[PDB]
Symmetry: C3
Subunit: 127 residues, 3 copies
């Protein structure tokens, strides 16, 4: 059940649960960026991680940013074996640019359990 986190620069922040019982770990921007109104952006984190066996890491939205700033996460599927820098894709569905500073929390990581070793069987009909 280990979540291994690698901080790639001094600007990274270890992901943190917002509360003791939160489903997700908040993910912090490591560099300023603005997500334009009715536009999108890719936020740097300067982190890598290896999620637990049996999961993938889902980059999910924070509800406050959704309501107040019209922000939704895009993409969001991080494989357990990914060792590159994790990036957060954000869409801004509002009419106001959304300014992000280093150290702002921009999403939350959820360790989603999945079946990642299914046997695929082709059949004539599911019926």
């Amino acid at each position: 059940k280990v979540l291994k986190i690698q901080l790639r620069s001094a600007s990274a922040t270890v992901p943190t649960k917002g509360s003791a019982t939160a489903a997700g770990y908040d993910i912090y921007a490591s560099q300023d960026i603005t997500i334009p109104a009715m536009g999108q952006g890719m936020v740097s984190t300067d982190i890598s991680f290896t999620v637990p066996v049996g999961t993938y890491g889902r980059i999910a939205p924070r509800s406050g940013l959704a309501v107040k700033n019209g922000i939704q996460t895009g993409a969001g599927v991080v494989d357990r074996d990914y060792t590159g820098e994790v990036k957060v894709v954000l869409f801004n569905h509002s009419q106001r640019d959304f300014a992000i500073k280093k150290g702002d929390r921009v999403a939350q990581l959820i360790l989603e359990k999945i079946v990642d070793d299914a046997q695929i069987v082709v059949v004539d009909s599911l019926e």
Copy 2:
């Protein structure tokens, strides 16, 4: 563990319904009329609170008909097991038509997603 506890906060709430014993999610119903403006967003009241099973969180996920026919996308959507407030549905309207919601309309579904909720974070110099 295999119990979903549901608190109704108003007479106009609806207990979420699966219907088919093998559907993924429980339908979530608006408890108050609301209009989601075109190219805009809104927060739908449900007048329910719930506690999902241990080892899950509640994901507010889209109904399929609304996405195609109305340009509606479900936003936010992560409900913690220990949340006791009113559950609200965040909807974005990416179409050019306002989307009218009436009390009793199905607006989303709740999926009890299994997660690792007790991981230990280990900070390492390299994942290699």
Copy 3:
């Protein structure tokens, strides 16, 4: 755990992982379609599937199409008992039309584990 796939036409492609340890099975368009700028569309796949017991099929976005083309999946909850054709609903949040050709990978299927046998208990307080 078995993922059963029904191919409804010769234009369908059996879903494939992008690599041996990918989380998701890439889903292929079976017919050309254009997703309009700032609008949405529905991609045919000409497949049906029955996911493993204990899961549902989530139609999740690919990161490249998100960044490059402004594409987000919509809807995307495939119940284990759904036997119809699975279509991929795409939102295009960009101001550019997105053209899809038969055989393009347009989304990824994730076999998400869930509690699908909970019992509802109505209580006066949590």
